[PDB]
Amino acid sequence: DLRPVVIDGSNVAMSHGNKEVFSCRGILLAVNWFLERGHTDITVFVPSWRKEQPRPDVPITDQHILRELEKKKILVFTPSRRVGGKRVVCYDDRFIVKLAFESDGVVVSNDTYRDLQGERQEWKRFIEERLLMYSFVNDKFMPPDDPLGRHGPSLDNFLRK
Ligand code: NA
């Protein structure tokens, strides 16, 4: 029944808590929301530099959650590294999109990826049809019952095949 679920870990962690803080529980909270409904195939994507320790230079909370979810075969780090002077991160976005697209699943994010809509035509289609936004109120992950709006489908149908 249930469509595969690809979450954008950075979109979510940033949303949750302080907007200027990578809040890892946001990620957990999202994952459980899908775990409670019965979903078993969930990928969260997050860049690999988010493991390093510490980045007292980038604010973050409950970092230990990231490896916990990697262990449960849900979180997957995206590649990154330090080239010459600074840093180089393989867009999280392409992994998130590709995966969902190639698994005919859904993407949990409030990013619409207007660049990736623009690059490939087929992807623009997919995002319009299968992005799933949300709001957080404190620790409460609240996705809409009307994900495409009055005219599209009910949330339960959105998560089915
Ligand atoms: Na945050």
Side-chain angles (χ1 to χ4, degrees), residues 1-85 87-160:
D1 24 73
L2 302 185
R3 313 183 77 85
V5 175
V6 178
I7 304 180
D8 183 336
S10 316
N11 185 258
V12 161
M14 296 302 288
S15 305
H16 176 280
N18 213 277
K19 325 308 278 171
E20 224 87 288
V21 172
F22 187 104
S23 171
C24 300
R25 313 205 2 277
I27 291 183
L28 192 32
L29 289 176
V31 168
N32 291 334
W33 188 86
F34 294 93
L35 263 28
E36 302 331 276
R37 297 163 78 82
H39 285 276
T40 37
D41 183 49
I42 295 154
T43 292
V44 182
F45 274 132
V46 172
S48 65
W49 60 272
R50 263 22 158 120
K51 284 180 280 215
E52 293 155 13
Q53 182 170 305
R55 283 265 68 213
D57 297 42
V58 193
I60 173 162
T61 66
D62 309 294
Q63 197 164 193
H64 70 285
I65 290 183
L66 298 186
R67 276 146 173 190
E68 292 172 345
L69 297 168
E70 198 191 27
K71 248 160 103 78
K72 302 230 227 142
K73 251 108 169 163
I74 297 180
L75 180 143
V76 173
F77 294 102
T78 257
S80 24
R81 51 150 172 180
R82 285 189 183 79
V83 187
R87 170 182 280 151
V88 177
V89 318
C90 289
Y91 288 138
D92 226 25
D93 300 353
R94 262 192 198 71
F95 279 86
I96 293 158
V97 168
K98 249 172 118 93
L99 201 220
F101 177 99
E102 293 188 63
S103 50
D104 205 35
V106 302
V107 176
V108 183
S109 163
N110 300 312
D111 197 323
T112 47
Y113 312 106
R114 77 310 291 147
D115 298 320
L116 307 186
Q117 290 191 18
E119 280 167 37
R120 190 162 293 172
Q121 231 303 127
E122 324 175 324
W123 277 341
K124 158 130 113 200
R125 266 278 65 113
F126 176 73
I127 292 151
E128 289 172 23
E129 223 202 64
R130 297 208 205 275
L131 185 66
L132 168 69
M133 294 169 116
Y134 60 98
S135 301
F136 264 109
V137 184
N138 312 122
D139 290 344
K140 157 146 47 189
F141 185 63
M142 288 191 60
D145 290 323
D146 44 339
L148 275 98
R150 275 211 49 173
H151 282 329
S154 112
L155 177 69
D156 293 311
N157 285 324
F158 196 70
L159 308 194
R160 298 226 211 176

mmCIF file of all heavy atoms in Angstrom, residues 108-140:
data_model
loop_
_atom_site.group_PDB
_atom_site.id
_atom_site.type_symbol
_atom_site.label_atom_id
_atom_site.label_comp_id
_atom_site.label_asym_id
_atom_site.label_seq_id
_atom_site.Cartn_x
_atom_site.Cartn_y
_atom_site.Cartn_z
ATOM 1 N N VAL A 108 9.225 14.932 1.884
ATOM 2 C CA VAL A 108 8.707 15.728 2.974
ATOM 3 C C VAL A 108 9.612 16.939 3.131
ATOM 4 O O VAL A 108 10.743 16.786 3.580
ATOM 5 C CB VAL A 108 8.646 14.880 4.244
ATOM 6 C CG1 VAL A 108 8.042 15.667 5.380
ATOM 7 C CG2 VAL A 108 7.815 13.638 3.984
ATOM 8 N N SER A 109 9.128 18.120 2.749
ATOM 9 C CA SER A 109 9.931 19.331 2.825
ATOM 10 C C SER A 109 9.064 20.552 2.548
ATOM 11 O O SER A 109 8.064 20.457 1.862
ATOM 12 C CB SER A 109 11.058 19.258 1.805
ATOM 13 O OG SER A 109 11.624 20.518 1.551
ATOM 14 N N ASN A 110 9.406 21.703 3.113
ATOM 15 C CA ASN A 110 8.798 22.949 2.682
ATOM 16 C C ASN A 110 9.633 23.653 1.611
ATOM 17 O O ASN A 110 9.250 24.743 1.175
ATOM 18 C CB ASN A 110 8.532 23.858 3.876
ATOM 19 C CG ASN A 110 7.578 23.224 4.894
ATOM 20 O OD1 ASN A 110 6.539 22.705 4.527
ATOM 21 N ND2 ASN A 110 7.946 23.239 6.173
ATOM 22 N N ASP A 111 10.743 23.045 1.162
ATOM 23 C CA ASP A 111 11.440 23.507 -0.045
ATOM 24 C C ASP A 111 10.727 22.955 -1.286
ATOM 25 O O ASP A 111 10.321 21.798 -1.304
ATOM 26 C CB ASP A 111 12.878 23.033 -0.077
ATOM 27 C CG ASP A 111 13.751 23.811 -1.069
ATOM 28 O OD1 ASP A 111 13.318 24.207 -2.167
ATOM 29 O OD2 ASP A 111 14.923 24.014 -0.760
ATOM 30 N N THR A 112 10.610 23.781 -2.323
ATOM 31 C CA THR A 112 9.991 23.393 -3.586
ATOM 32 C C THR A 112 11.005 23.124 -4.704
ATOM 33 O O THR A 112 10.645 22.688 -5.800
ATOM 34 C CB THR A 112 9.103 24.535 -4.023
ATOM 35 O OG1 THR A 112 9.841 25.763 -3.891
ATOM 36 C CG2 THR A 112 7.925 24.581 -3.109
ATOM 37 N N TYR A 113 12.273 23.419 -4.419
ATOM 38 C CA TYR A 113 13.386 23.094 -5.304
ATOM 39 C C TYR A 113 13.193 23.676 -6.685
ATOM 40 O O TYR A 113 13.264 22.960 -7.668
ATOM 41 C CB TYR A 113 13.525 21.599 -5.407
ATOM 42 C CG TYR A 113 13.500 20.892 -4.083
ATOM 43 C CD1 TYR A 113 12.387 20.175 -3.681
ATOM 44 C CD2 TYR A 113 14.610 20.914 -3.242
ATOM 45 C CE1 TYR A 113 12.374 19.508 -2.466
ATOM 46 C CE2 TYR A 113 14.611 20.239 -2.027
ATOM 47 C CZ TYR A 113 13.492 19.537 -1.642
ATOM 48 O OH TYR A 113 13.472 18.894 -0.432
ATOM 49 N N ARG A 114 12.934 24.978 -6.749
ATOM 50 C CA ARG A 114 12.668 25.648 -8.026
ATOM 51 C C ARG A 114 13.822 25.498 -9.052
ATOM 52 O O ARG A 114 13.559 25.488 -10.254
ATOM 53 C CB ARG A 114 12.182 27.128 -7.835
ATOM 54 C CG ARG A 114 13.212 28.208 -7.479
ATOM 55 C CD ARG A 114 14.135 27.844 -6.302
ATOM 56 N NE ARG A 114 13.463 27.792 -4.984
ATOM 57 C CZ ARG A 114 13.777 26.969 -3.973
ATOM 58 N NH1 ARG A 114 14.744 26.074 -4.083
ATOM 59 N NH2 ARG A 114 13.083 27.041 -2.843
ATOM 60 N N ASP A 115 15.065 25.323 -8.595
ATOM 61 C CA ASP A 115 16.183 25.018 -9.507
ATOM 62 C C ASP A 115 15.996 23.665 -10.175
ATOM 63 O O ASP A 115 16.112 23.520 -11.393
ATOM 64 C CB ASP A 115 17.514 24.965 -8.765
ATOM 65 C CG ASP A 115 17.883 26.271 -8.130
ATOM 66 O OD1 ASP A 115 17.648 27.324 -8.758
ATOM 67 O OD2 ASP A 115 18.410 26.232 -6.991
ATOM 68 N N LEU A 116 15.728 22.663 -9.354
ATOM 69 C CA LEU A 116 15.560 21.311 -9.846
ATOM 70 C C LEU A 116 14.276 21.194 -10.637
ATOM 71 O O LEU A 116 14.155 20.309 -11.453
ATOM 72 C CB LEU A 116 15.577 20.285 -8.696
ATOM 73 C CG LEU A 116 16.774 20.302 -7.719
ATOM 74 C CD1 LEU A 116 16.689 19.136 -6.740
ATOM 75 C CD2 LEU A 116 18.111 20.281 -8.449
ATOM 76 N N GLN A 117 13.307 22.074 -10.403
ATOM 77 C CA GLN A 117 12.101 22.089 -11.235
ATOM 78 C C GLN A 117 12.507 22.536 -12.621
ATOM 79 O O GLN A 117 12.047 21.982 -13.618
ATOM 80 C CB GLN A 117 11.040 23.027 -10.670
ATOM 81 C CG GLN A 117 10.411 22.531 -9.383
ATOM 82 C CD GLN A 117 9.181 23.313 -8.954
ATOM 83 O OE1 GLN A 117 8.549 24.031 -9.735
ATOM 84 N NE2 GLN A 117 8.835 23.171 -7.697
ATOM 85 N N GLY A 118 13.404 23.526 -12.644
ATOM 86 C CA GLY A 118 13.871 24.174 -13.858
ATOM 87 C C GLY A 118 14.791 23.311 -14.692
ATOM 88 O O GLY A 118 14.660 23.285 -15.917
ATOM 89 N N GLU A 119 15.724 22.612 -14.039
ATOM 90 C CA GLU A 119 16.657 21.708 -14.745
ATOM 91 C C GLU A 119 15.900 20.671 -15.562
ATOM 92 O O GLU A 119 15.844 20.752 -16.794
ATOM 93 C CB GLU A 119 17.608 21.004 -13.776
ATOM 94 C CG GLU A 119 18.777 21.864 -13.330
ATOM 95 C CD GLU A 119 19.495 21.252 -12.144
ATOM 96 O OE1 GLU A 119 19.595 20.002 -12.113
ATOM 97 O OE2 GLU A 119 19.950 22.001 -11.246
ATOM 98 N N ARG A 120 15.293 19.713 -14.878
ATOM 99 C CA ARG A 120 14.575 18.663 -15.563
ATOM 100 C C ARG A 120 13.094 18.902 -15.558
ATOM 101 O O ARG A 120 12.523 19.313 -14.568
ATOM 102 C CB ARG A 120 14.859 17.326 -14.914
ATOM 103 C CG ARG A 120 14.333 16.161 -15.727
ATOM 104 C CD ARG A 120 14.990 14.868 -15.310
ATOM 105 N NE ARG A 120 16.409 14.844 -15.632
ATOM 106 C CZ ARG A 120 17.249 13.894 -15.232
ATOM 107 N NH1 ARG A 120 16.822 12.884 -14.482
ATOM 108 N NH2 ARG A 120 18.531 13.947 -15.576
ATOM 109 N N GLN A 121 12.467 18.599 -16.672
ATOM 110 C CA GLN A 121 11.058 18.868 -16.838
ATOM 111 C C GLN A 121 10.216 17.849 -16.060
ATOM 112 O O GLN A 121 9.148 18.168 -15.543
ATOM 113 C CB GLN A 121 10.714 18.823 -18.335
ATOM 114 C CG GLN A 121 9.960 20.046 -18.840
ATOM 115 C CD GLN A 121 8.675 20.281 -18.073
ATOM 116 O OE1 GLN A 121 8.419 21.374 -17.559
ATOM 117 N NE2 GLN A 121 7.869 19.239 -17.970
ATOM 118 N N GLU A 122 10.718 16.622 -15.984
ATOM 119 C CA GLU A 122 9.966 15.491 -15.425
ATOM 120 C C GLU A 122 9.877 15.641 -13.938
ATOM 121 O O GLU A 122 8.927 15.174 -13.308
ATOM 122 C CB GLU A 122 10.668 14.150 -15.686
ATOM 123 C CG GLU A 122 11.397 14.008 -17.014
ATOM 124 C CD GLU A 122 12.152 12.701 -17.096
ATOM 125 O OE1 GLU A 122 12.683 12.268 -16.052
ATOM 126 O OE2 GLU A 122 12.224 12.111 -18.196
ATOM 127 N N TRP A 123 10.927 16.243 -13.390
ATOM 128 C CA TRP A 123 11.054 16.473 -11.969
ATOM 129 C C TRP A 123 10.084 17.558 -11.505
ATOM 130 O O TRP A 123 9.432 17.403 -10.459
ATOM 131 C CB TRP A 123 12.484 16.895 -11.626
ATOM 132 C CG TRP A 123 13.487 15.767 -11.464
ATOM 133 C CD1 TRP A 123 13.218 14.448 -11.230
ATOM 134 C CD2 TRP A 123 14.921 15.890 -11.463
ATOM 135 N NE1 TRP A 123 14.389 13.745 -11.113
ATOM 136 C CE2 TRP A 123 15.448 14.606 -11.249
ATOM 137 C CE3 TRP A 123 15.809 16.964 -11.638
ATOM 138 C CZ2 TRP A 123 16.828 14.361 -11.204
ATOM 139 C CZ3 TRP A 123 17.184 16.718 -11.591
ATOM 140 C CH2 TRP A 123 17.675 15.429 -11.373
ATOM 141 N N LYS A 124 9.999 18.653 -12.270
ATOM 142 C CA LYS A 124 9.033 19.704 -11.992
ATOM 143 C C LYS A 124 7.657 19.072 -11.786
ATOM 144 O O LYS A 124 6.995 19.338 -10.776
ATOM 145 C CB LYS A 124 9.009 20.729 -13.113
ATOM 146 C CG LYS A 124 7.713 21.525 -13.166
ATOM 147 C CD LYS A 124 7.933 23.030 -13.237
ATOM 148 C CE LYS A 124 7.491 23.643 -14.538
ATOM 149 N NZ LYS A 124 8.192 24.940 -14.646
ATOM 150 N N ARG A 125 7.255 18.222 -12.729
ATOM 151 C CA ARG A 125 6.027 17.434 -12.613
ATOM 152 C C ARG A 125 5.920 16.785 -11.251
ATOM 153 O O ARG A 125 4.974 16.996 -10.518
ATOM 154 C CB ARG A 125 5.989 16.319 -13.673
ATOM 155 C CG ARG A 125 5.261 16.649 -14.972
ATOM 156 C CD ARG A 125 3.740 16.489 -14.886
ATOM 157 N NE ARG A 125 3.135 17.447 -13.947
ATOM 158 C CZ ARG A 125 2.322 18.456 -14.274
ATOM 159 N NH1 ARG A 125 1.945 18.668 -15.532
ATOM 160 N NH2 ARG A 125 1.861 19.256 -13.318
ATOM 161 N N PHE A 126 6.924 15.993 -10.923
ATOM 162 C CA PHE A 126 6.904 15.144 -9.737
ATOM 163 C C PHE A 126 6.753 15.920 -8.432
ATOM 164 O O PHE A 126 5.975 15.548 -7.538
ATOM 165 C CB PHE A 126 8.186 14.334 -9.697
ATOM 166 C CG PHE A 126 8.314 13.484 -8.473
ATOM 167 C CD1 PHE A 126 7.544 12.336 -8.317
ATOM 168 C CD2 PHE A 126 9.204 13.828 -7.459
ATOM 169 C CE1 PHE A 126 7.663 11.546 -7.173
ATOM 170 C CE2 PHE A 126 9.318 13.048 -6.308
ATOM 171 C CZ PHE A 126 8.546 11.908 -6.164
ATOM 172 N N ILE A 127 7.516 16.999 -8.328
ATOM 173 C CA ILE A 127 7.480 17.866 -7.150
ATOM 174 C C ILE A 127 6.087 18.432 -6.957
ATOM 175 O O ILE A 127 5.535 18.352 -5.856
ATOM 176 C CB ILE A 127 8.486 19.021 -7.276
ATOM 177 C CG1 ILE A 127 9.910 18.456 -7.221
ATOM 178 C CG2 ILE A 127 8.283 20.041 -6.173
ATOM 179 C CD1 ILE A 127 10.914 19.282 -7.990
ATOM 180 N N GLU A 128 5.524 19.000 -8.024
ATOM 181 C CA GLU A 128 4.175 19.549 -7.955
ATOM 182 C C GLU A 128 3.207 18.518 -7.420
ATOM 183 O O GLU A 128 2.295 18.847 -6.658
ATOM 184 C CB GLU A 128 3.683 19.977 -9.319
ATOM 185 C CG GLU A 128 4.347 21.210 -9.880
ATOM 186 C CD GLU A 128 3.920 21.438 -11.312
ATOM 187 O OE1 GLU A 128 2.841 20.940 -11.703
ATOM 188 O OE2 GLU A 128 4.666 22.096 -12.057
ATOM 189 N N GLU A 129 3.417 17.269 -7.822
ATOM 190 C CA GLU A 129 2.451 16.227 -7.559
ATOM 191 C C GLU A 129 2.700 15.545 -6.238
ATOM 192 O O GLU A 129 1.799 14.898 -5.711
ATOM 193 C CB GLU A 129 2.491 15.178 -8.672
ATOM 194 C CG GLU A 129 1.123 14.707 -9.148
ATOM 195 C CD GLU A 129 1.187 13.343 -9.817
ATOM 196 O OE1 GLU A 129 1.530 12.349 -9.142
ATOM 197 O OE2 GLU A 129 0.906 13.260 -11.027
ATOM 198 N N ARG A 130 3.911 15.665 -5.700
ATOM 199 C CA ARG A 130 4.294 14.787 -4.599
ATOM 200 C C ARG A 130 5.172 15.338 -3.452
ATOM 201 O O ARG A 130 5.620 14.569 -2.586
ATOM 202 C CB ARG A 130 4.939 13.549 -5.183
ATOM 203 C CG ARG A 130 4.018 12.720 -6.064
ATOM 204 C CD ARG A 130 4.498 11.297 -5.975
ATOM 205 N NE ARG A 130 4.166 10.463 -7.120
ATOM 206 C CZ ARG A 130 3.008 9.834 -7.263
ATOM 207 N NH1 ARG A 130 2.057 9.934 -6.333
ATOM 208 N NH2 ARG A 130 2.801 9.100 -8.343
ATOM 209 N N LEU A 131 5.382 16.655 -3.426
ATOM 210 C CA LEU A 131 5.949 17.340 -2.258
ATOM 211 C C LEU A 131 4.950 17.338 -1.111
ATOM 212 O O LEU A 131 3.795 17.538 -1.318
ATOM 213 C CB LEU A 131 6.272 18.785 -2.618
ATOM 214 C CG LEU A 131 6.977 19.594 -1.529
ATOM 215 C CD1 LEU A 131 8.370 19.022 -1.283
ATOM 216 C CD2 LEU A 131 7.058 21.075 -1.906
ATOM 217 N N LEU A 132 5.394 17.106 0.101
ATOM 218 C CA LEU A 132 4.492 17.117 1.229
ATOM 219 C C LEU A 132 5.021 18.074 2.280
ATOM 220 O O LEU A 132 5.984 17.756 2.973
ATOM 221 C CB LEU A 132 4.344 15.728 1.831
ATOM 222 C CG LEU A 132 3.636 15.683 3.186
ATOM 223 C CD1 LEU A 132 2.179 16.045 2.981
ATOM 224 C CD2 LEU A 132 3.716 14.342 3.891
ATOM 225 N N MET A 133 4.346 19.220 2.417
ATOM 226 C CA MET A 133 4.729 20.259 3.359
ATOM 227 C C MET A 133 4.186 19.974 4.717
ATOM 228 O O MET A 133 3.463 19.014 4.918
ATOM 229 C CB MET A 133 4.200 21.553 2.828
ATOM 230 C CG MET A 133 4.970 21.784 1.556
ATOM 231 S SD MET A 133 4.169 23.251 0.547
ATOM 232 C CE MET A 133 5.576 24.644 0.536
ATOM 233 N N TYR A 134 4.561 20.792 5.677
ATOM 234 C CA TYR A 134 4.193 20.566 7.051
ATOM 235 C C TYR A 134 4.372 21.850 7.849
ATOM 236 O O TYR A 134 5.073 22.747 7.402
ATOM 237 C CB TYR A 134 5.115 19.527 7.609
ATOM 238 C CG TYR A 134 6.562 19.955 7.546
ATOM 239 C CD1 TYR A 134 7.192 20.503 8.641
ATOM 240 C CD2 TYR A 134 7.295 19.813 6.388
ATOM 241 C CE1 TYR A 134 8.518 20.904 8.587
ATOM 242 C CE2 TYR A 134 8.622 20.233 6.319
ATOM 243 C CZ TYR A 134 9.217 20.784 7.422
ATOM 244 O OH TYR A 134 10.518 21.185 7.345
ATOM 245 N N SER A 135 3.715 21.950 9.002
ATOM 246 C CA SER A 135 4.105 22.938 9.994
ATOM 247 C C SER A 135 4.474 22.224 11.281
ATOM 248 O O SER A 135 4.064 21.094 11.498
ATOM 249 C CB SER A 135 3.024 23.951 10.238
ATOM 250 O OG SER A 135 2.693 24.652 9.033
ATOM 251 N N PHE A 136 5.324 22.852 12.089
ATOM 252 C CA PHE A 136 5.640 22.350 13.411
ATOM 253 C C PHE A 136 5.027 23.302 14.356
ATOM 254 O O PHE A 136 5.208 24.518 14.216
ATOM 255 C CB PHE A 136 7.131 22.387 13.690
ATOM 256 C CG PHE A 136 7.818 21.110 13.428
ATOM 257 C CD1 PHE A 136 8.663 20.980 12.374
ATOM 258 C CD2 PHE A 136 7.631 20.043 14.263
ATOM 259 C CE1 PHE A 136 9.290 19.791 12.135
ATOM 260 C CE2 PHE A 136 8.261 18.844 14.041
ATOM 261 C CZ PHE A 136 9.096 18.720 12.977
ATOM 262 N N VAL A 137 4.346 22.769 15.351
ATOM 263 C CA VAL A 137 4.011 23.581 16.506
ATOM 264 C C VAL A 137 4.689 22.929 17.700
ATOM 265 O O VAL A 137 4.341 21.832 18.067
ATOM 266 C CB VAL A 137 2.508 23.671 16.726
ATOM 267 C CG1 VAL A 137 2.224 24.602 17.876
ATOM 268 C CG2 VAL A 137 1.810 24.156 15.478
ATOM 269 N N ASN A 138 5.665 23.605 18.293
ATOM 270 C CA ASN A 138 6.606 22.960 19.227
ATOM 271 C C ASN A 138 7.103 21.654 18.707
ATOM 272 O O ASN A 138 7.777 21.653 17.679
ATOM 273 C CB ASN A 138 5.975 22.834 20.587
ATOM 274 C CG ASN A 138 5.359 24.127 21.003
ATOM 275 O OD1 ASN A 138 4.154 24.203 21.282
ATOM 276 N ND2 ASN A 138 6.163 25.190 20.951
ATOM 277 N N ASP A 139 6.760 20.563 19.397
ATOM 278 C CA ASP A 139 7.179 19.214 19.033
ATOM 279 C C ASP A 139 6.111 18.486 18.243
ATOM 280 O O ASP A 139 6.170 17.267 18.080
ATOM 281 C CB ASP A 139 7.484 18.374 20.281
ATOM 282 C CG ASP A 139 8.748 18.821 21.023
ATOM 283 O OD1 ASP A 139 9.577 19.588 20.442
ATOM 284 O OD2 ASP A 139 8.909 18.368 22.200
ATOM 285 N N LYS A 140 5.142 19.204 17.725
ATOM 286 C CA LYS A 140 4.070 18.544 17.008
ATOM 287 C C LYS A 140 4.142 18.726 15.485
ATOM 288 O O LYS A 140 3.962 19.822 14.979
ATOM 289 C CB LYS A 140 2.738 18.983 17.586
ATOM 290 C CG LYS A 140 1.567 18.832 16.639
ATOM 291 C CD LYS A 140 0.246 18.456 17.326
ATOM 292 C CE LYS A 140 -0.058 19.291 18.552
ATOM 293 N NZ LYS A 140 -1.237 18.724 19.263
#
